[PDB]
Every structure is written in structure tokens, then in C-alpha cells.
Design a binder for this molecule. Structure first.
Ligand code: SF4
Ligand code: SF4
Ligand code: FES
Ligand code: FES
Ligand SMILES: [K+]
Ligand SMILES: [Zn+2]
Lengths: 124, 696, 112, 183, 70, 160
């Protein structure tokens, strides 16, 4: 409708089509940043007149992939430790407080951590 | 009272009771510090400033230890080097490894002082881990990452003493002590955002500015603020074509390192609702046009209505530069017109203060003399919302002395104690004749402050008559060295417009039914007459009610995109400095009038900015003396005050209502700012909502 | 001093008849307590009213035509900066640095 | 102890719950203020908070706001005082607060055994509360009764020179409804 | 040369002695996104990479509206 | 040999010196330097010691990546070394090494900042080519090609 293709939204109101070349990403229709130029507007340029849009680089949207990861629930501890699950090949190790009654993501990886006592509240 | 001490073999001399860290700065010796700020109360909770007194077996904190005569101070012995490394290690023990994701990265005092004075290696390998602290929500302006706090209490000291907001403090004990408001609420203060600058670490950061830039990328321009009539000096940071953030810069005479939340967070409105192309109205729609076509249409529309002498009306808004005001005045004058005024709603066609005498409409005492005030009278003003920085200065003097502040008018939430008297001229007459007027007469340096909203009420003439009679009849208010009469404006263009006489003193002129109206940034025109058949031209940088009422729109540049002259409420001439270029095909505001003048047969003799600025000297000789206040002589000042004394004028007994309704919506830039939209939803129009209804 | 050294410097004439330089001392940043950057006098040029920055449409690069946009001279004294600006025949203006007023500060004042 | 520096609204503890000193505590509070100079009446926050705590049961957010309004002080100032001292219970707590000292002088004479015996009797770990809202086990620092090191405290009463078999009897007394002899 | 898959490009250049088909399960790369057939260099074709700005314009113009005067 | 640097004082090598000062002598010297360099390379392989390869000072040398992601102080030093760099005390120097082309020297001026105030690069080829007129006068055209080759001229060095 060209409104979902040119406006930043938290979620796509429809199912992304992997074969649609007007989407921002193969797995996401709408852009994920307010300053991110829409792909449909970008491809409407004189330099795409005789160019095949299918072979252009279209990496998957990282925002949709990170939220497919289940929340890590910590038992008998209010602090979560994350370093990228790689150690020396990850990110600097940081400590996440889990006192609040919600899942709190990592500052680097985006993995979300929470206490098991809040599992019922978060899922609903 | 001076004491001759020694700092690393350097003779120093300062006032008795000065801290060692103050004497070290005067001697050129640099001592690291985290918890010490030269504008806050003394704390010794960070221990980074430790020095060695010559004959004493204990290390003294230089920010709190008073100076003595004959004291010899060492600041670079190996013992002190051990202390600096030890304190640095303790600070970084629990600090999170957040520099890449932390907005303080390139401008962090913890980073720079740890590099300069701490060790190059850490020894914290504990498997238990660091302390983790949850993030507090205190509104949409201040972003909190409390893991990074070093418990320095700069925010607590500032918000309680300077800002006057006691909802922020330290809760807990020991390693579990957490800065915040304990309960889930926001910080309600027009100066709350200054806490971001004071926080040396990334614990408190700007939320609109989060993640968008690094300090080494930005270009720094020293310009002035135009969101109020104080003219607070600011440092605008730009990254190419876009303004990223606004920061205050030191000026002890005007703003003193502080700015209001409106000043530093309205910069995001420069990217919204901007006027970039000339617009020509065709029925009920605006269409784009070239500059030649737009200027020709105005000339064609000028000859369609055939306006006469006073049928040409010029209106100047709050954000209008002084070069454009004189250019518009001269173009208006060349067309044989005198109907010029501002977009205000003053009842009397000539404002009660007038324009003949500068002393009648300026802060004659100057802002820096509030430090010496003993008695202050507020007449129908709300300094907390009109001059946020100047309001905090009064609190600082109030805290450190027996200064008494009396208020006449509408009561408001204040940061100090107000001795309220009434809400009309009748109370002011009682006060100036009663005990309140006796205090001013006996005061050594009294202050009288009239609000800009007094001239917008029906009792404008009575208020200026009551004060002028009291001022002229008392010999202590006006002296060769002191002048206790002050007017506090809320718009940055008023004093500049009055200095050039851009106002009509003839009631007959102002009642003319105009046929050609030139809106120069004027937007408060709901109560100002605009004939339906009149030809309206709007010149500005934002699309607002002024643009919608126009027939041809001429895009101008903002204050950050032009070297412009602004005169503040105390009669201080300040010049802006261009940081970026105007967007689209927008031009400088004084060049649009000059270019249009040639299309109207009234070609102005101005070609460049220097010639335009030379015209300012002809209109008024003090307009080319930047950063200098030219005072009114004692003899001339008395005549101007005496001219305000008008016998045989009645007092209607109406409320001296405060002029500002919404603190975050005072001009086009603030209204267009998305951040101010969040402030209204969260903080409220009067900054009274303690709970955030837009934060989940 | 009086010698017009711009006749032999080789710089274009636009530096004299069209550009304005600012002699200033850098103000202390509001986010930091250091004052090292305020100890030197610097000279920079005012931006061009047009063509200072514009967006390149191919990649979003910040294009410019001002060749002095990235030049900032460093001086140790104000007099040296004035003497150099006068020697080159530049149109300049001096921004006087703001000086901080001294106020006594002691821990006893927290209660008195 | 259990140190939390953030208040979260709960049905048991939220500012909407009205609180006010009873007519008996209204008079006794005035005597407390009279023990301080009139220009330094803010020094009576500590006795007023405890006066409300005994009346209500714990130092709720309604008590802290009530004391702040009573003494004409910002609520945050009262929040700082209440959260700095460990005897201000910012949670409903039980009828009898069980305070077991674990410091070195008490640890030498077998304070560990005292904690072990109580945990397996009340079936609540330290910091928890019995389901019937009758008991509350709390780990506490030195209370001064270190010469009689195996010492415990219940509410306002001390209990010195204890043994694991003696501590069960004291708990049994409170569970039954009989006050054991303190000494 | 660009037709060689990145898996075997490193092995051919003597960068390692373990071919990608002999890789341990823990030594392999984990992709949360699907994998397609190898695409070589697309120069001199219609599928050549076309650069473009991924950012929106930094200023938004005013949407004009007309309000009638009383 | 005149100003030893970087462990050149802990290896044994000889220098070939000509007598006639012509191209053939310089060819023979460069062939001896070939074998003397191979002699030094053998000693470096045998005498390579253990220990750090950079100064143990994280305010100048970047910290290890593993230590960077675990230590607070290492991250700060890593952050500042790559964003602001390291400041060098004010002063000037003239450091010369026995480059394969000859004497290569740098005149670096420091102002106490993280950026060099002046960096004059002295090129042996620049000085060698300045004597080409004095050396190649009277010779024939094919001799000029030999003289250019015998000076070991790389014009990036000359035109630095
Ligand atoms: S506050 Fe300073 S030291 Fe801490 S993470 Fe941010 S930049 Fe690094
Ligand atoms: S939040 Fe910032 S200003 Fe406040 S105490 Fe912590 S470091 Fe200091
Ligand atoms: S600066 Fe003196 S102890 Fe903090
Ligand atoms: S050590 Fe336990 S009461 Fe003192
Ligand atoms: K900060
Ligand atoms: Zn992570």
C-alpha cells in the first residue's frame, strides 16, 4: 500500500514476502529506523532503470531475527552476565540487572534476560 | 584578607577561606576532580583531589580544605600519585564496560582522568562480577544508565540547590546506594537537563541526542539563544548540514553555564515544518514558485490593492533578527508608511513603557547585579517560566543572604519563598505605600522587576504609573551608580525592535484597515486584525499560523543559519554566528526585504551585511557594540520615568495574568520540535505532572 | 607589520575580499572540567552562506566548496594572532574570551 | 540485610492507601517535636517514622509521605532517612521479627547452629515470612549482646545465651501464644 | 575465480588444511538466515551492485495548509 | 655502527667499502650486503628471545583484545588510543637509520598534542639524484641509465 513500505514500524502488519523486491528486507516489509531510507524510494532512481533488482544485496533484517530468540531466564539470581556467547570473539562482558518485572536486553547482542519468577508476567 | 600560600613551589594569593583546589587553579596547577564543581556546594565524597599538606600526616581533600597563610601544598609527590591510582581503581572496579555503547565516550571525564592519573592496567578479575543497577525513569529528557554512576552527587546538589527540585536524592546505604527519586516519577524542572552536562559519566545522558553522534565529529559554534529575552550564550554543535545538540557556554553576566530545557531541546524543530521553497497561493492550495515569480507576484499584488500611506502594515515576530527589522522598517518608510509593530497584543497602541527612553524597557540593573540585590519586587511576572536562568540566579542570592522577594500578581509555583501581596494594581498601590515600599526605600540596592505580560493587560498604564511615581519620589532607586527599575521581556526581538523604534506611537495609525500586510515571522495573530481581502506576505523559516494566513510565502533562515543581531532584556547587543546553511532555497532574512524592495520601486541602499550593519549605527549608535551594555545616564533616566507618571488615569483592578501558557510552546521552533511534544505529554504545560503518562 | 605579505603568499584574492576570519579563544566545554583547550588562541573562517555543505545524492556524502572549512590555525598569544592576520591582509574580528568571576568556596558554607 | 533502594507500587504498599496517626499518637508525636528546636524540627523524622511503623506495622510509602507532609519536608528527604536505616521495614513483615546475629563474637559460640535449627523448624529461609504472617527470619549484624554470644532478638526483646534446643522452645512459645522469659 | 564458493576459497589458497566439508560442527558458522546458491561477481551485467544512500533527507519541508481569516 | 638501534648492537656483521667510487664498486658492496644481511637473519632466528613485542604501556600500545573485553581500564585505553591517540611530549628530534637506500632520517616536531606538528622526511634518493648532474656530466647516454640504477632511486621516496 506504500504506507507499510515507507514508514518505520515496530512490527509488520502483514507477512513478509521473500520474493517481493519492494520490501526493506526479504524478511521484513517496513524499515526499522526513522532515518532509514525506504528501499522502494531508493530503488526509484535513474541508476536502477536497466538494473535487475533481484540480484541487488538484500541482507535479512536483524531486528526480526533477534526477536525470534527466546528470553533467557535466570534462576536464583537477579544479575545476568553476557559476553556474546563467544568469549574472546564476542563483545565486552556486561552485567544486566533483573530486578524489574520485565525482560531486559543485552547492550550489544540484544539477547533478553529476565528472572524465572517473572516468566508468567512477561509471557502474558 | 589574602593569604600567601605555596602550591608546588608557586606563590598564590586568594581570599581567606578559599579551598586549596581554587588556589591551585589560580597558580596553574591542575588537580583531578570528579565531585567538585565551581557552582555547586562542597562535597568530599570522591576523594580524587587529595593533596599533601606540608606539615601534616594526613591527606587533605583540596576541594574542602580551607586555605591558611604560610600553608605549603604539594600536589605531585609519589604519595599523591599512589592515591590517584588507588582512587581510580576503586571507581573503575564496578564500572560497566560500556564505552562503545555509551554517549559520553569521547567527552568522558572518567576516561580522561583515568588515562591521565590512573594506571594503564586493571586488576579486577572477580568471578562474582560487578554491581548491577536498574535504570530509573525520570521522564523523556534525561536518559539513565545507573551502572555508570560514580556516586558523585553533582545531580543531587544541583537539582536541590540550583534548580530547586527536591525530588532527586540518594536512597540506600553503602554499595547498594542508588541515585534517583526512589518512587517512580519524573524530574520536574525547567533546568533539569543541565544535570546531563554536570554528570561527568554516561549515567545521565540526553535522550533525544542518544546514539546519534560522537563529540569529535561535531563542529562547535559559539552563538546566542533566541528562545527567550535573556540571550543565554550557547555552543551549537553541528555535523555538516544538521545541528546535533545545543550546549551552554560560560558567561557569568548572562546565563552562568546554565540554559533552560526549552533552549537545548528545541533544536530538533529545525528539521521539521521548515520553509524551504517560495510558495504562492492559488485558491485554497499553496504551490511552489521561483524567487523571481514569488517576488513578482508580491509586486503584482501590491499594485492590485493600491495601498496608501498607513494601509501598509508590517508585523515582526519573536524570532526576527534586527537587520530584518530595520530593513523592513526602511522599506515600509520608503513606501510612505509608518504602521509597524510587533505581533503582541498590547492594549494601548503605544506600549506603557514606550520607546523614547531605553531605560523604560530594559533591565537597567543588569543580570549580574542581582548578586548584590537586597530587596526584589516582582510585578505580574513569572521568572521561573519566562527567564528560567535568571530565576535560578535569584534563588542563589536568596539562599546565601537575607534577600526578600515580594510578588504582585498571579501566584505561581516558585523555587524560592515569595511574599505574595495581591493580584491587581490595587495591591501594588497598597504595597508601595505600606511596609513593602518602606523596605525598598531603606534597601541599599533595591530591585523592581515588571513582567512583559503587564503591557498585555488592561491595567498596563496604571502599573507603570504606580512604579514610576514611587521610583521618582524615592532617591535610592535611581542613583549615579544604581538603577532599580527593570523590565523582564520574554522575546528576543522586543528590545531590538524598540531600540530602532519599530513601534507605532500614534493610535490613529494602528487602527488603519491594512491592505498590504508583511508578516516578518509573526505567528501570534489570532487577536491581530487581518482583513480577508488584504494581501499578506509571510517571511520566516517555519510553516505555522503565519504561513497559513499568507498569500505568498518567502522562506527565510533560522538563527543558526545567519549572522544576526539580537538585543536582550538588559540592552546587551549580541551577534549570532552561522553554523549551517538554510535548507532548500531559503535566503537570509534581510536580503529578502532588500531584493523585494527593488521589485516595489523602493530599492534600499544596502548591498552587503557590512552596509546593513552600518545602517544599524545610523538608527542607534549602540547597535554595533557587541557584548556591551550602554547604560542610560542618571539625568535622562529620571525624565523617562517621570514621563511614565500619568495623573488622571484610572486603575481597573484586573488580574496581572502571567503571559506564558505553555512553557514548551513559545515560538515556531519549539512548537515544531518533537521533543517539546513529548515534554507536554509527560511534564505538562506548567511542568506540574509528577507522573509520566507516556512512559511504559 | 605594514608590509602587504599577501601579495607574495600566493593565496587567492577571495581570502581578502570575500572571507571573514574569527580570532577567538576556545570556550570551556560544558560537559568536561578540563581547561587545556582554552589556553591557546585560534583562527578559523566563517562559513560560506551558500555551498558550505550540501548533500551528494549518490551516497549522502557532505559535499563542500569551501577550501578553508577545515583549516584552524593555532597561536600562543592574542597579539601573535592579530599580527599574523594583519600581515596577511585578512578581514577579521576578535571574540574576547569570557572570564570566570572568582567566588570563595569552602565546606563551612554548606551550613553557614 | 535485604537492601532495596527502589519502591514499587503494590496493593499492600502504595501511596493511595490513606494513613494518619491515631488520636493517641497525634498527641505523643507533639512531645517528640518539642524535644527539638523549632527551627530544626526536621530532626524528628526518625522518631515519627518509628511511631508510624509501630502503629501500622511497617514503614509503608504512605507513612513516609505522611511524615513528610507533617514536618513540611519534601518526600524524598524522608525517603533518604527511611532507606538508610535497617530497622525501617519497607515491607509488611511478620508479627515477630527474628533477628539472629552472625558476627564473629556471636559466630564463635555457635550462632550457626541457631540459624540451622530455626530454618528447619519454621521452614523459611532467612529473609522470608511464614505463611500465616506470624514470623519473619532476618540475618542481623552485631546487636551488642556479644558476651552472651548465642543471642537472638524477637521484635523488641532480646534473648541471650541460647542453644539450638532452647531456640525451638522460644519459637514454640510464640507459636502457641506464650511469651518466653527474656534473659 | 569469483565462482569459487567462500567456503573453498580459503582452502584453495592454502589458508588451512581442513576443507569446509571436513569441518567440525563447532567450527562451522551458525546462520539464523537461510542460505542460497553461491553468486559470483556480477560486474559487466545487469545485476551489478548499484550504490545508494540509506539515509533519509536531513530536513523535511512544510506541508502547506490554508486557513481562512475571520 | 655509528648509532646502533633496535638490537643491531647484538649481531655480528661486516660492511663492504669500495676504493674506486664507481658503479662496479657499488655493485660489489650491494652483493656483500646481501650476504651480510643473510648472516644477520640467521643470528636473529637463533637469538630470538621470549617476551612482549610491544611496550608494556597501554597508554601508547593497544591492549590485547581478550583483556579489552574483560577489563574496565583496558577498554578505556583501547577507546582513547583509537579515537584521540596518545600525546607526545613537546620537542623535536632527528632520527636516522641505515636504510637500504642510504641514510633515511625524519625531523619530527611535537607540540604536546596527539598529532605531529611537523614531519620532515629526509630521503637518501632525493640527495643522490641532486648529484646526478655533477656525476653524469661527460658520460654517454647509456651510462646515465647505469648511474640512475646505481643510485637505487625510488621516486616516492624522492617526492615524499
Ligand atoms: S561513562 Fe566514561 S568510562 Fe563509563 S562507559 Fe561511558 S565513556 Fe566509558
Ligand atoms: S548520576 Fe552523574 S551527576 Fe549524579 S552522582 Fe552519579 S555521576 Fe554524579
Ligand atoms: S574533588 Fe575533592 S573529594 Fe571530590
Ligand atoms: S557480635 Fe553478636 S551481638 Fe555483638
Ligand atoms: K553526562
Ligand atoms: Zn551480550
Amino acid at each position: 500500500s506504500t504506507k507499510e513500505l515507507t514508514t518505520a514500524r515496530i512490527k509488520d502488519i502483514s507477512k513478509p514476502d521473500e520474493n517481493n523486491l519492494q520490501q526493506q528486507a526479504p524478511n521484513r516489509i517496513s524499515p526499522w529506523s526513522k532515518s532509514q531510507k525506504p528501499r522502494a524510494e531508493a530503488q526509484d532512481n535513474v541508476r536502477f532503470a536497466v538494473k535487475d533488482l533481484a540480484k541487488q544485496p538484500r541482507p535479512y533484517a536483524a531486528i526480526d531475527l533477534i526477536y525470534k530468540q527466546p528470553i533467557r531466564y535466570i534462576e536464583h539470581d537477579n544479575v545476568a552476565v553476557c559476553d556474546g556467547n563467544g568469549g574472546a570473539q564476542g563483545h565486552p562482558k556486561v552485567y544486566i540487572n533483573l530486578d524489574q518485572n520485565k525482560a531486559i536486553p543485552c547492550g550489544y547482542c540484544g539477547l533478553r534476560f529476565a528472572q524465572a519468577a517473572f516468566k508468567e508476567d512477561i509471557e502474558s | 584578607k589574602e593569604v600567601e600560600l605555596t602550591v608546588d613551589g608557586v606563590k598564590v594569593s586568594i581570599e581567606a577561606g578559599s579551598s586549596i583546589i581554587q588556589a591551585a587553579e589560580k597558580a596553574g596547577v591542575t588537580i583531578p576532580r570528579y565531585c567538585y564543581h565551581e557552582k555547586l556546594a562542597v562535597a568530599g565524597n570522591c576523594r580524587m583531589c587529595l593533596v599533601e599538606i606540608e606539615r601534616s600526616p594526613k591527606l587533605a581533600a583540596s576541594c574542602a580544605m580551607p586555605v591558611q597563610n604560610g600553608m605549603s601544598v604539594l600536589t605531585n609527590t609519589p604519595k599523591i600519585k599512589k592515591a590517584r591510582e588507588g582512587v581510580t581503581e576503586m571507581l573503575l572496579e564496578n564500572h560497566p564496560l560500556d564505552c562503545p555503547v555509551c554517549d559520553q565516550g569521547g567527552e568522558c571525564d572518567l576516561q580522561e582522568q583515568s588515562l591521565r592519573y590512573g594506571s594503564d592496567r586493571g586488576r579486577f578479575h572477580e568471578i562474582v562480577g560487578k554491581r548491577a543497577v536498574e535504570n530509573k525513569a525520570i521522564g523523556p529528557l534525561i536518559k539513565t544508565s545507573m551502572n555508570r554512576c560514580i556516586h558523585c552527587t553533582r545531580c543531587v546538589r544541583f537539582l536541590n540547590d540550583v534548580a530547586g527540585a527536591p525530588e532527586f536524592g540518594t536512597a540506600g546505604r553503602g554499595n547498594d546506594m542508588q541515585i534517583g527519586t526512589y518512587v517512580e516519577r519524573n524530574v520536574n524542572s525547567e533546568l533539569s537537563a543541565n544535570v546531563i552536562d554536570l554528570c561527568p559519566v554516561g549515567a545521565l545522558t540526553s535522550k533525544p541526542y542518544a546514539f546519534r553522534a560522537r563529540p569529535w565529529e561535531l563542529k562547535r559554534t559559539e552563538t546566542i539563544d533566541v528562545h527567550d529575552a535573556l540571550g543565554s550564550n550557547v555552543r551549537v554543535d553541528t555535523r555538516g548540514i544538521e545541528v546535533m545538540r545545543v550546549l551552554p557556554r560560560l558567561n557569568d553576566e548572562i546565563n552562568e553555564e546554565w540554559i533552560s530545557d526549552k533552549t537545548r531541546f528545541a533544536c530538533d524543530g529545525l528539521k521539521t515544518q521548515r520553509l524551504t521553497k517560495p510558495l504562492i497561493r492559488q485558491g485554497n492550495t499553496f504551490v511552489d514558485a521561483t524567487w523571481e515569480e514569488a517576488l513578482a507576484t508580491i509586486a503584482e499584488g501590491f499594485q492590485k490593492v493600491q495601498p496608501k500611506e498607513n494601509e501598509i502594515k508590517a508585523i515582526v515576530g519573536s524570532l526576527t533578527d534586527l537587520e530584518s527589522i530595520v530593513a523592513l522598517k526602511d522599506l515600509v518608510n520608503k513606501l510612505g508608511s509608518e504602521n509597524v509593530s510587533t505581533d503582541g497584543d498590547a492594549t494601548t497602541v503605544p506600549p506603557a513603557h514606550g520607546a523614547d527612553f531605553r531605560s523604560n524597557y530594559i533591565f537597567n540593573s543588569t543580570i549580574d547585579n542581582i548578586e548584590e540585590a537586597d530587596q526584589i519586587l516582582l510585578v505580574g511576572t513569572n521568572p521561573r517560566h519566562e527567564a528560567a536562568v535568571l530565576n535560578a540566579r535569584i534563588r542563589k542570592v536568596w539562599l546565601r543572604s537575607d534577600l526578600e522577594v515580594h510578588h504582585v500578581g498571579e501566584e505561581f509555583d516558585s523555587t524560592f519563598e515569595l511574599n505574595h501581596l495581591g493580584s491587581d494594581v490595587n495591591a501594588l498601590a497598597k504595597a508601595l505605600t505600606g511596609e513593602v515600599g518602606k523596605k525598598l526605600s531603606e534597601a541599599s540596592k533595591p530591585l523592581i522587576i515588571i513582567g512583559s505580560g503587564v503591557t498585555e493587560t488592561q491595567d498596563a498604564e496604571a502599573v507603570y504609573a504606580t512604579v514610576a511615581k514611587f521610583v521618582t519620589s524615592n532617591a535610592n532607586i535611581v542613583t549615579p551608580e544604581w538603577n532599580g527599575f527593570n523590565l523582564l521581556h520574554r522575546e528576543a526581538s522586543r528590545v531590538g525592535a524598540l531600540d530602532v523604534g519599530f513601534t507605532t506611537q500614534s493610535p490613529e495609525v494602528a487602527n488603519t484597515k491594512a491592505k498590504f500586510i508583511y508578516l516578518l515571522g509573526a505567528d501570534e495573530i489570532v487577536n491581530k486584525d487581518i482583513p480577508k481581502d488584504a494581501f499578506v506576505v509571510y517571511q520566516g523559516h517555519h510553516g505555522d499560523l503565519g504561513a497559513s494566513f499568507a498569500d505568498v510565502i518567502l522562506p527565510g533562515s533560522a538563527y543558526t543559519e545567519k549572522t544576526a543581531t539580537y538585543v536582550n532584556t538588559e540592552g546587551r547587543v549580541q551577534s549570532t554566528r552561522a553554523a549551517t546553511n538554510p535548507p532548500g532555497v531559503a535566503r537570509e532574512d534581510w536580503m529578502i526585504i532588500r531584493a523585494l524592495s527593488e521589485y516595489l520601486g523602493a530599492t534600499l541602499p544596502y548591498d552587503n551585511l557590512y552596509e546593513m550593519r552600518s545602517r544599524l549605527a545610523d538608527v542607534a549608535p549602540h547597535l554595533l557594540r557587541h557584548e556591551v551594555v550602554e547604560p542610560v545616564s542618571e539625568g535622562i533616566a529620571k525624565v523617562g520615568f517621570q514621563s511614565l507618571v500619568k495623573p488622571g488615569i484610572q486603575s481597573k483592578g484586573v488580574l496581572l495574568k502571567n503571559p506564558i501558557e505553555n512553557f514548551y510552546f513559545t515560538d515556531v521552533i519549539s512548537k515544531s520540535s518533537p521533543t517539546m511534544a513529548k515534554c507536554v505529554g509527560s511534564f505538562g504545560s506548567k511542568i506540574e505532572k509528577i507522573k509520566d503518562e507516556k512512559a511504559n | 607589520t605594514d608590509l602587504a605579505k599577501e601579495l607574495v603568499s600566493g593565496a587567492p584574492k577571495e581570502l581578502i575580499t570575500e572571507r571573514v576570519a574569527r580570532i577567538y579563544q576556545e570556550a570551556k566545554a560544558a560537559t568536561q572540567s578540563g581547561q587545556h583547550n582554552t589556553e591557546t588562541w585560534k583562527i578559523d573562517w566563517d562559513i560560506l552562506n551558500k555551498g558550505n555543505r550540501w548533500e551528494n545524492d549518490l551516497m549522502g556524502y557532505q559535499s563542500s566548496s569551501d577550501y578553508m572549512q577545515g583549516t584552524i590555525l593555532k597561536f600562543d598569544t592574542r597579539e601573535g594572532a592579530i599580527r599574523f592576520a594583519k600581515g596577511q591582509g585578512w578581514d577579521y574580528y576578535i571574540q574576547e574570551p569570557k572570564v570566570r568571576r572568582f567566588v570563595k568556596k569552602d565546606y563551612s558554607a554548606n551550613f553557614y | 540485610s535485604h537492601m532495596i533502594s527502589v519502591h514499587r507500587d503494590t496493593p499492600k504498599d502504595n501511596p493511595e492507601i490513606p494513613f494518619e496517626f491515631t488520636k493517641e499518637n497525634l498527641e505523643r508525636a507533639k512531645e517528640i517535636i518539642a524535644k527539638y528546636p523549632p527551627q530544626y524540627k526536621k530532626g524528628a523524622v526518625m522518631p515519627l517514622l518509628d511511631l508510624g511503623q509501630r502503629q501500622l506495622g511497617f514503614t509503608s510509602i504512605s507513612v513516609m509521605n505522611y511524615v513528610a507532609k507533617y514536618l513540611d519536608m519534601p518526600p524524598m528527604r524522608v525517603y533518604e532517612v527511611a532507606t538508610f536505616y535497617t530497622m525501617y521495614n519497607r515491607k509488611p513483615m511478620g508479627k515477630y521479627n527474628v533477628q539472629v546475629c552472625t558476627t564473629t563474637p556471636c559466630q564463635l559460640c555457635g550462632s550457626d547452629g541457631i540459624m540451622k535449627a530455626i530454618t528447619e523448624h519454621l521452614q523459611i529461609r532467612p529473609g522470608q515470612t511464614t505463611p500465616d504472617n506470624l514470623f519473619t527470619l532476618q540475618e542481623v549484624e552485631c546487636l551488642g549482646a556479644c558476651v552472651n554470644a548465642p543471642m537472638i532478638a524477637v521484635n523488641d526483646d532480646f534473648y541471650e545465651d541460647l542453644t539450638p534446643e532452647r531456640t525451638v522452645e522460644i519459637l514454640k512459645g510464640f507459636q502457641s501464644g506464650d511469651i518466653p522469659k527474656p534473659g | 575465480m569469483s565462482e569459487v564458493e567462500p567456503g573453498w576459497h580459503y582452502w584453495l589458497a592454502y589458508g588451512t588444511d581442513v576443507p569446509p566439508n571436513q569441518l567440525k560442527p563447532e567450527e562451522k558458522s551458525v546462520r539464523a538466515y537461510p542460505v542460497k546458491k553461491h553468486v559470483p561477481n556480477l560486474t559487466y551485467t545487469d545485476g551489478a551492485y548499484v550504490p545508494y544512500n540509506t539515509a533519509r533527507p536531513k530536513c523535511a519541508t512544510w506541508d502547506p495548509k490554508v486557513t481562512e481569516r475571520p | 655502527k655509528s648509532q646502533p638501534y633496535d638490537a643491531y648492537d647484538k649481531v655480528d656483521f661486516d660492511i663492504a667499502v669500495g676504493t674506486k667510487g664507481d658503479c662496479y664498486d657499488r655493485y660489489l658492496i650491494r652483493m656483500t650486503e646481501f650476504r651480510q644481511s643473510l648472516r644477520i637473519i640467521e643470528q636473529c632466528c637463533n637469538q630470538m628471545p621470549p617476551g612482549p613485542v610491544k611496550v608494556e604501556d597501554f597508554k601508547v600500545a593497544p591492549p590485547p583484545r581478550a583483556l579489552m573485553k574483560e577489563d574496565m581500564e583496558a577498554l578505556i585505553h583501547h577507546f582513547l588510543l583509537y579515537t584521540k591517540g596518545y600525546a607526545v611530549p613537546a620537542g623535536e628530534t632527528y632520527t636516522a637509520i641505515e636504510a637500504p637506500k642510504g641514510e633515511m632520517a625524519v625531523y619530527v616536531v611535537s607540540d604536546g598534542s596527539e598529532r605531529p606538528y611537523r614531519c620532515k622526511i629526509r630521503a637518501p634518493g632525493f640527495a643522490h639524484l641532486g648529484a646526478f648532474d655533477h656525476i653524469a656530466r661527460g658520460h654517454f647516454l647509456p651510462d646515465a641509465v647505469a648511474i640512475i640504477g646505481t643510485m637505487d632511486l625510488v621516486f616516492g621516496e624522492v617526492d615524499r
